[PDB]
Amino acid sequence: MLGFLSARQTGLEDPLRLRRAESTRRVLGLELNKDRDVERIHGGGINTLDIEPVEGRYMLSGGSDGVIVLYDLENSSRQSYYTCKAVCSIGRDHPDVHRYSVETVQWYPHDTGMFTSSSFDKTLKVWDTNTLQTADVFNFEETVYSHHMSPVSTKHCLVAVGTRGPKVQLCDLKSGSCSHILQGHRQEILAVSWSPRYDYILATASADSRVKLWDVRRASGCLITLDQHNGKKSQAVESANTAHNGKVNGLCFTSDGLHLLTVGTDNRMRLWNSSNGENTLVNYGKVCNNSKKGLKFTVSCGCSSEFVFVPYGSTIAVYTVYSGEQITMLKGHYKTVDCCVFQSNFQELYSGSRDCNILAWVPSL
Amino acid sequence: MSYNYVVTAQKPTAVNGCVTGHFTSAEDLNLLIAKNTRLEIYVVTAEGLRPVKEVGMYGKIAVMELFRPKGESKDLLFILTAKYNACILEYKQSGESIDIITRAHGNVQDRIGRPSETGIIGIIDPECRMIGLRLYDGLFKVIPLDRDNKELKAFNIRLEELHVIDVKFLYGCQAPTICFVYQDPQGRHVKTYEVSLREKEFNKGPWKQENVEAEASMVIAVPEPFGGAIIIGQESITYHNGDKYLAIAPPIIKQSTIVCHNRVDPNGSRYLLGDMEGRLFMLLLEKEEVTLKDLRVELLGETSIAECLTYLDNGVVFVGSRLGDSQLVKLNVDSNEQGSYVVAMETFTNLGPIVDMCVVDLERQGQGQLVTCSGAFKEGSLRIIRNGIGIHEHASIDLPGIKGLWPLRSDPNRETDDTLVLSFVGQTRVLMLNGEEVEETELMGFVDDQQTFFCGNVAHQQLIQITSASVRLVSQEPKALVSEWKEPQAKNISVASCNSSQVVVAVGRALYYLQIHPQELRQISHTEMEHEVACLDITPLGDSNGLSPLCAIGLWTDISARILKLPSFELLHKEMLGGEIIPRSILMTTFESSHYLLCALGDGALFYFGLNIETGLLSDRKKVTLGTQPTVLRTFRSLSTTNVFACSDRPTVIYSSNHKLVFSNVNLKEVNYMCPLNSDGYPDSLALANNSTLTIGTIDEIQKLHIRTVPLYESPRKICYQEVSQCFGVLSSRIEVQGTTALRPSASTQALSSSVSSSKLFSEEVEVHNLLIIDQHTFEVLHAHQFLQNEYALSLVSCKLGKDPNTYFIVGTAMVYPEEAEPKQGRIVVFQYSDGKLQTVAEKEVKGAVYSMVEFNGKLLASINSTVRLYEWTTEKELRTECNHYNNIMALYLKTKGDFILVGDLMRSVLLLAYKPMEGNFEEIARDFNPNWMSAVEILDDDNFLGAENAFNLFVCQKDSDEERQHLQEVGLFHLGEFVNVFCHGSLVMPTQGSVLFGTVNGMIGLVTSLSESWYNLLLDMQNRLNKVIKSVGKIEHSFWRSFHTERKTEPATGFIDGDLIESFLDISRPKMQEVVANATADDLIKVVEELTRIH
Amino acid sequence: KLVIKNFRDRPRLPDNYTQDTWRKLHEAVRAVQSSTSIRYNLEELYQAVENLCSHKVSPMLYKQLRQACEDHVQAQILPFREDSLDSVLFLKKINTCWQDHCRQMIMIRSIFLFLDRTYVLQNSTLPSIWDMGLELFRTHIISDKMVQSKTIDGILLLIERERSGEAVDRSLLRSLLGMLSDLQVYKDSFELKFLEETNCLYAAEGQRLMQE
């Protein structure tokens, strides 16, 4: 690596080159760390994690027992080994704790002061990071598998909420109105996601093997309805254009926002184009999943070749997004993995499982 | 909140882009050069270049291309700042005034997107309908131009190819056609599309994609007669047009990849190509009536390492170089007997990538003198930067024993000085200036056989001579005596100071004030001063017709400067200088209508008091030390202003810039005497004299950095000054190809003595590192010590460790092999230099690469890959570990102050590691938990740790004030705009506490200093007002330009003052100064900014 | 660097200038040492030193200066070699013999300022005309064992008087302890004895006063 240092020193290669090459090297050498720990606080499994977007310091986690821990990943100690102490926690003793499993906790974008969560108690609560008090609560008529806030929108603050009804809900964290709904799906909505690039493009995955991108400004259906064979087996859109063969329960736009990775219960990933819904035929091999709710997964940022970290049974699988190769298989858990989140700042990966653990993977050397 | 001041001593000199075209006007031929932020416009006259403007863009100029829309009389200019500010500059000259008016400006940054691997590529349609930018991978940002965009409302066109190597617009297509080379897992594939504005989306290309070489890395859109695009590569140059395909694999270009191209002919019959090695090819296209017959590549010769070259005319090719000197070469039609058609005409000095530099007080003065290791593989060299005012020596003469110089208008009719009067011990010689020819004459009336204290033209067409015996008045025609005032009691004259109409001579204790009258020396008055007179002057001041009413004197016993009114010799004022050293030369002079009495003590110390001409009241007693030997203050005129030249062992010029005197070194070993010699053959010269020679040469204008150059022809990496041995230690790193042989004679191969490191610890092209020992007078490599095979010397520090007195060169190396990614085996060699020999005193094999090292209170503090272990120098003379520290990602940079250690991690960005001596173990006082990729880090004060990250930014960590005290706080943030390679405490000048020079990769040498909070608030208000007043080149808001920017973070600049913006306050006319100071008076703030300008 | 040579070089600068000129200063140095008013005048002497520095005779001129001071300081030891004096009066004798050497050796510096700073300053081996004076005084007067003995025993004996409540010449002590410090023999010769004697007295006083 001294070659990269000298090249950067004499201005040959842009500093970008060393930065990205070193980030890729670190992610390729990713391994579990016994030189770091995250305190065990959840009675049941961990369903979700979301490192804060700005400064990458705090870290929420939605336990399956309704407790929302709020970790602190900065090594405030002096020793090489440390444990990420849990700063706060919405314990069961809290008056407004979630009665059932918390399956999505997300920071309010552009404002770390607040964060949101939602649970099978058919509620979505807007939590205040400082005083830990519900700022706003929206009660739905049915459960809430997954919700997501636009990480790019400075204009609106709508919140797609995929209930187990066929209708996507849009909740407004400004003056409350959950009236706006997006009709067109046929079964439960297991995973939604806003477009990181465009303000108003929402991609919603369902359990009927359909992935649709909605222009929420448009109030006459969806822009696109993803189709496996790119229209080869052309059929009108009444029972066709199925992005999978079984339930599709996970979405993750690539970091640039140009491609919409989807993973479904048919045991395949597919890197769909995000502008016209044309499958790009990246193989990815066979990816194992059997979960019956929102499967979380994330994609690396600031690396030469974009990696995707998909929960694969009880192991994290690391694929290269644009080539489909399998980099490795991080292997440290005791039950199925429910959510892995990438710490972009230092190329660290935190993967909550169903065994109440949150294993923090870090690079070697 | 910390407070700091960042100013640019040396403007950047790396040329990252240069274009040619008619920018100033239709018939012109400009050569724009895009130095990092400077935009140096030029005009290609028949010889050389005629610079016409130099505007500092508020941006890193990443793309520069000239385009001529339909209806424009002269080419516009498009500039894309690396922060993605796009502006269509237009030149517009209005008489003297030159203004780069901005036709249209806008920001073309997408909020989210991977910055492209190859970097920003910005291209323009040859018919000038759109400007194609490829900023982020996957997207292809197109800017329309057919509509009149006053904001450059670009629109993204999606690209289905995610890794585009290079993209160019094709020539002669009815629709704007791009022709790019992208990489997909099957290889690389040229491809084409038809951009279409109305559709805002590509279409099918005019000629479908094709396969290209595995390393096809460039595109050349050939002009209309041929069409198509050439595609250069590692080993092939494939020409494509869709149906034609002419591909060749010349053997010469296999040696080194081609990186820069340019079109010689407007029909593209011939093309230039330069490669990394520095060669300069010439691609020739043969035409058939048209089509293309065959391609040929010819090696024109060699030039600097060409980053971007252009063809101007008549073979004048400007080889703009980032690494070496931006050359300017002539393409001879025939060989130069070396097979090289290229002969370097000119050269532009370029402080290339400053890998590292050291401030040294060389020549033992009080003047800092940088020594940078600029350059790269072939252009590696040492640059020695030093302030000063150079001397263009026109004529040097051998004349030992000179003891005084004066100019004489030996002919009353002539205006210029035609005669120079030397004066030697106990005699005098007259020198006649008849053109450049100079012969000694005899001036009748001047006694040759006595020393002279003064002789010059005076009133009434007469000379004068004041020997050690008698003041003499000579009729200028026919050059015979008319009056000889002598001491009444026949004693030798001890002092004398004359002017146009007054002569005062101090014989011992007693004065005698003569007034010159036509053919009559009338002794008006006299007096008996108390103590023996030392020095005196009666220089006229104000507007008196050569009648000075004051006569400053300095006395021997009671060391004191006085001012005696004339002709009564009334003691208007007395001033005790103090000390045990007598005054030696006392001068009365004017500086921008501010009077001064510069009195110089005999020890070299100099005083200057603010003199009140009417009342003679010395105020503002200031002292400046300029040398050691006794000084001699002689006035001289330069460009309609009068300066003062302080002849000593350190010849120093004194001139007043903005009512503040400036004391500037003169680049000369010694100057005993001087005289302003305005001769016919040497108009407006200085006849500088020294012990052995007499020199003539015009002196320069106000100060500026003077850059020597010591070529090494091999890339240096580090530098250290070992004072005791009087030599620099430089870590060159040359390239070898095969055994192994050198590709060119480098300094390491041309050393007086050498030695190969025979080490038993461990048992294409490679780098064979060395440790050169450079003599610090001749700059001749005394000893070149070669390191082991496959060993990289990363660190070098000169120190004495432990208790022994010897001073050691210590190099931390790191073995490198291609198979591994991070090094594993390194060693810390301890060299000693003595008697022209370099012995290995110790050796300490380690378990990783030794990145950076710093002597720590006599204990060596290495940094093995991810650990910072503090070695100890045992009395047995082998380094012995004391304590380690492992909590790092990779410790690359170390800096120390007292016992604190600042560790610049690769990405965790700081660690204020403190050494507890009572316990013997490191203790992390604090850390900053931001992911700031570092480049170099330095310590200012106890709680100010400057750092420079790799996104072209600066930040200042301040130790705050429980566990949160372990967080270092970032208080200062400032987007410098350069990649800082090195910091080093010091300055280049003999208000701002602290001074930290820092190099860059572009050659900029900034200078960071701390400020008091009061001046910080004042200057911040000034900066905001100036932003509101000054109009920038691209209408780029300064607050945006300096906003601390990274791909993941963007914050406004704070705790930093843009030094250049403040200094621009000097160069703005008075009405706009009054605007800037609408709410303190303008002169006060001019004074403040002058006090700031003094630092660099 | 267009060198030019189109000259006629007739003259010769010095007649017998160095030998005669030094004898001018030699009287001036002799006159200054004996406090006799200088018949010649300093500017002529200073400018005379200037010219002799042009002829590169600075080394020999530096040496011949040494013989002047060397041969005067030695002339001052002999009055102190007579032991018809008590301790207190002796200290004023030697102290004046030091104050005069400072007043004189400043004067010899002023005349020879050019030689001191042009030639001697660069020649780091040689000491300045000032430190030259201290070296002469130290080795040829103060390094005298009998003078050093009866001197340090002088200063010590006054401090013991001062400790016992007497009033002593503080100014005289300040000059001598200034004199020793400038000559650098303060630490080796006087500090050890003073600390040694002081240890004794307060040690004796301590045990003496405890029971009282």
PDB file of N, CA and C in Angstrom, chain B residues 309-347:
ATOM      1  N   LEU B 309      -0.214  19.277 -22.884  1.00  0.00           N
ATOM      2  CA  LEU B 309       0.588  20.056 -23.811  1.00  0.00           C
ATOM      3  C   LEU B 309      -0.273  20.547 -24.961  1.00  0.00           C
ATOM      4  N   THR B 310       0.132  21.677 -25.534  1.00  0.00           N
ATOM      5  CA  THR B 310      -0.587  22.300 -26.631  1.00  0.00           C
ATOM      6  C   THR B 310       0.409  22.767 -27.677  1.00  0.00           C
ATOM      7  N   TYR B 311      -0.059  22.870 -28.917  1.00  0.00           N
ATOM      8  CA  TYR B 311       0.743  23.384 -30.018  1.00  0.00           C
ATOM      9  C   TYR B 311       0.280  24.798 -30.334  1.00  0.00           C
ATOM     10  N   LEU B 312       1.205  25.754 -30.270  1.00  0.00           N
ATOM     11  CA  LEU B 312       0.869  27.155 -30.496  1.00  0.00           C
ATOM     12  C   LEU B 312       1.112  27.561 -31.948  1.00  0.00           C
ATOM     13  N   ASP B 313       2.367  27.507 -32.392  1.00  0.00           N
ATOM     14  CA  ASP B 313       2.744  27.753 -33.778  1.00  0.00           C
ATOM     15  C   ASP B 313       4.249  27.570 -33.894  1.00  0.00           C
ATOM     16  N   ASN B 314       4.706  27.327 -35.122  1.00  0.00           N
ATOM     17  CA  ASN B 314       6.136  27.288 -35.433  1.00  0.00           C
ATOM     18  C   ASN B 314       6.884  26.305 -34.540  1.00  0.00           C
ATOM     19  N   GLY B 315       6.222  25.221 -34.151  1.00  0.00           N
ATOM     20  CA  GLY B 315       6.849  24.245 -33.290  1.00  0.00           C
ATOM     21  C   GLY B 315       6.957  24.653 -31.841  1.00  0.00           C
ATOM     22  N   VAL B 316       6.386  25.792 -31.455  1.00  0.00           N
ATOM     23  CA  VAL B 316       6.407  26.231 -30.063  1.00  0.00           C
ATOM     24  C   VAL B 316       5.323  25.446 -29.332  1.00  0.00           C
ATOM     25  N   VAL B 317       5.718  24.354 -28.683  1.00  0.00           N
ATOM     26  CA  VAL B 317       4.814  23.477 -27.953  1.00  0.00           C
ATOM     27  C   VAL B 317       5.054  23.679 -26.468  1.00  0.00           C
ATOM     28  N   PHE B 318       3.995  24.003 -25.735  1.00  0.00           N
ATOM     29  CA  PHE B 318       4.088  24.280 -24.307  1.00  0.00           C
ATOM     30  C   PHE B 318       3.792  23.000 -23.542  1.00  0.00           C
ATOM     31  N   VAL B 319       4.826  22.384 -22.978  1.00  0.00           N
ATOM     32  CA  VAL B 319       4.671  21.093 -22.292  1.00  0.00           C
ATOM     33  C   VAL B 319       4.373  21.413 -20.834  1.00  0.00           C
ATOM     34  N   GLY B 320       3.110  21.725 -20.563  1.00  0.00           N
ATOM     35  CA  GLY B 320       2.688  21.987 -19.202  1.00  0.00           C
ATOM     36  C   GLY B 320       2.841  20.757 -18.338  1.00  0.00           C
ATOM     37  N   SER B 321       3.572  20.875 -17.235  1.00  0.00           N
ATOM     38  CA  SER B 321       3.945  19.729 -16.418  1.00  0.00           C
ATOM     39  C   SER B 321       3.521  19.956 -14.979  1.00  0.00           C
ATOM     40  N   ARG B 322       2.865  18.955 -14.394  1.00  0.00           N
ATOM     41  CA  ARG B 322       2.552  19.007 -12.973  1.00  0.00           C
ATOM     42  C   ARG B 322       3.758  18.686 -12.111  1.00  0.00           C
ATOM     43  N   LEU B 323       4.640  17.806 -12.582  1.00  0.00           N
ATOM     44  CA  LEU B 323       5.746  17.321 -11.767  1.00  0.00           C
ATOM     45  C   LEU B 323       7.014  18.139 -11.957  1.00  0.00           C
ATOM     46  N   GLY B 324       7.368  18.453 -13.197  1.00  0.00           N
ATOM     47  CA  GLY B 324       8.596  19.167 -13.475  1.00  0.00           C
ATOM     48  C   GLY B 324       8.393  20.638 -13.749  1.00  0.00           C
ATOM     49  N   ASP B 325       9.247  21.199 -14.597  1.00  0.00           N
ATOM     50  CA  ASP B 325       9.108  22.583 -15.012  1.00  0.00           C
ATOM     51  C   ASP B 325       8.227  22.650 -16.249  1.00  0.00           C
ATOM     52  N   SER B 326       7.319  23.616 -16.280  1.00  0.00           N
ATOM     53  CA  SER B 326       6.437  23.778 -17.430  1.00  0.00           C
ATOM     54  C   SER B 326       7.269  24.313 -18.582  1.00  0.00           C
ATOM     55  N   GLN B 327       7.807  23.409 -19.392  1.00  0.00           N
ATOM     56  CA  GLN B 327       8.761  23.785 -20.420  1.00  0.00           C
ATOM     57  C   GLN B 327       8.053  24.490 -21.573  1.00  0.00           C
ATOM     58  N   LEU B 328       8.832  24.854 -22.587  1.00  0.00           N
ATOM     59  CA  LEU B 328       8.308  25.445 -23.813  1.00  0.00           C
ATOM     60  C   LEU B 328       9.336  25.150 -24.893  1.00  0.00           C
ATOM     61  N   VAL B 329       9.001  24.250 -25.813  1.00  0.00           N
ATOM     62  CA  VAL B 329       9.993  23.627 -26.675  1.00  0.00           C
ATOM     63  C   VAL B 329       9.718  23.967 -28.131  1.00  0.00           C
ATOM     64  N   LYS B 330      10.761  23.823 -28.943  1.00  0.00           N
ATOM     65  CA  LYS B 330      10.725  24.082 -30.376  1.00  0.00           C
ATOM     66  C   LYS B 330      10.917  22.766 -31.111  1.00  0.00           C
ATOM     67  N   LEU B 331      10.014  22.466 -32.041  1.00  0.00           N
ATOM     68  CA  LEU B 331      10.079  21.231 -32.818  1.00  0.00           C
ATOM     69  C   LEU B 331      10.888  21.494 -34.078  1.00  0.00           C
ATOM     70  N   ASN B 332      12.175  21.167 -34.036  1.00  0.00           N
ATOM     71  CA  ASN B 332      13.010  21.315 -35.217  1.00  0.00           C
ATOM     72  C   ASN B 332      12.520  20.391 -36.322  1.00  0.00           C
ATOM     73  N   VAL B 333      12.514  20.905 -37.552  1.00  0.00           N
ATOM     74  CA  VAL B 333      12.117  20.084 -38.693  1.00  0.00           C
ATOM     75  C   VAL B 333      13.080  18.922 -38.884  1.00  0.00           C
ATOM     76  N   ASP B 334      14.330  19.080 -38.455  1.00  0.00           N
ATOM     77  CA  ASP B 334      15.355  18.059 -38.597  1.00  0.00           C
ATOM     78  C   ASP B 334      15.920  17.692 -37.232  1.00  0.00           C
ATOM     79  N   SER B 335      16.694  16.612 -37.214  1.00  0.00           N
ATOM     80  CA  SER B 335      17.236  16.092 -35.969  1.00  0.00           C
ATOM     81  C   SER B 335      18.196  17.089 -35.329  1.00  0.00           C
ATOM     82  N   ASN B 336      18.417  16.902 -34.029  1.00  0.00           N
ATOM     83  CA  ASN B 336      19.380  17.673 -33.257  1.00  0.00           C
ATOM     84  C   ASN B 336      20.655  16.883 -32.988  1.00  0.00           C
ATOM     85  N   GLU B 337      20.971  15.912 -33.851  1.00  0.00           N
ATOM     86  CA  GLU B 337      22.138  15.039 -33.724  1.00  0.00           C
ATOM     87  C   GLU B 337      21.969  14.001 -32.616  1.00  0.00           C
ATOM     88  N   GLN B 338      20.881  14.085 -31.848  1.00  0.00           N
ATOM     89  CA  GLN B 338      20.544  13.102 -30.831  1.00  0.00           C
ATOM     90  C   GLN B 338      19.257  12.361 -31.166  1.00  0.00           C
ATOM     91  N   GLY B 339      18.786  12.461 -32.408  1.00  0.00           N
ATOM     92  CA  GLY B 339      17.494  11.929 -32.771  1.00  0.00           C
ATOM     93  C   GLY B 339      16.320  12.672 -32.175  1.00  0.00           C
ATOM     94  N   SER B 340      16.559  13.798 -31.508  1.00  0.00           N
ATOM     95  CA  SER B 340      15.517  14.557 -30.834  1.00  0.00           C
ATOM     96  C   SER B 340      15.217  15.811 -31.640  1.00  0.00           C
ATOM     97  N   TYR B 341      13.972  15.945 -32.086  1.00  0.00           N
ATOM     98  CA  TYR B 341      13.546  17.135 -32.806  1.00  0.00           C
ATOM     99  C   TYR B 341      13.151  18.268 -31.873  1.00  0.00           C
ATOM    100  N   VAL B 342      13.323  18.093 -30.566  1.00  0.00           N
ATOM    101  CA  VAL B 342      12.788  18.995 -29.559  1.00  0.00           C
ATOM    102  C   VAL B 342      13.952  19.672 -28.850  1.00  0.00           C
ATOM    103  N   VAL B 343      13.948  21.002 -28.848  1.00  0.00           N
ATOM    104  CA  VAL B 343      14.969  21.800 -28.178  1.00  0.00           C
ATOM    105  C   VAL B 343      14.258  22.786 -27.263  1.00  0.00           C
ATOM    106  N   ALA B 344      14.539  22.699 -25.966  1.00  0.00           N
ATOM    107  CA  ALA B 344      13.822  23.490 -24.971  1.00  0.00           C
ATOM    108  C   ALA B 344      14.169  24.965 -25.129  1.00  0.00           C
ATOM    109  N   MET B 345      13.184  25.777 -25.518  1.00  0.00           N
ATOM    110  CA  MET B 345      13.418  27.211 -25.642  1.00  0.00           C
ATOM    111  C   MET B 345      13.452  27.884 -24.277  1.00  0.00           C
ATOM    112  N   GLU B 346      12.324  27.882 -23.579  1.00  0.00           N
ATOM    113  CA  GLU B 346      12.158  28.577 -22.309  1.00  0.00           C
ATOM    114  C   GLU B 346      11.917  27.557 -21.205  1.00  0.00           C
ATOM    115  N   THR B 347      11.596  28.064 -20.019  1.00  0.00           N
ATOM    116  CA  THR B 347      11.244  27.220 -18.888  1.00  0.00           C
ATOM    117  C   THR B 347      10.545  28.086 -17.854  1.00  0.00           C
TER     118      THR B 347
END
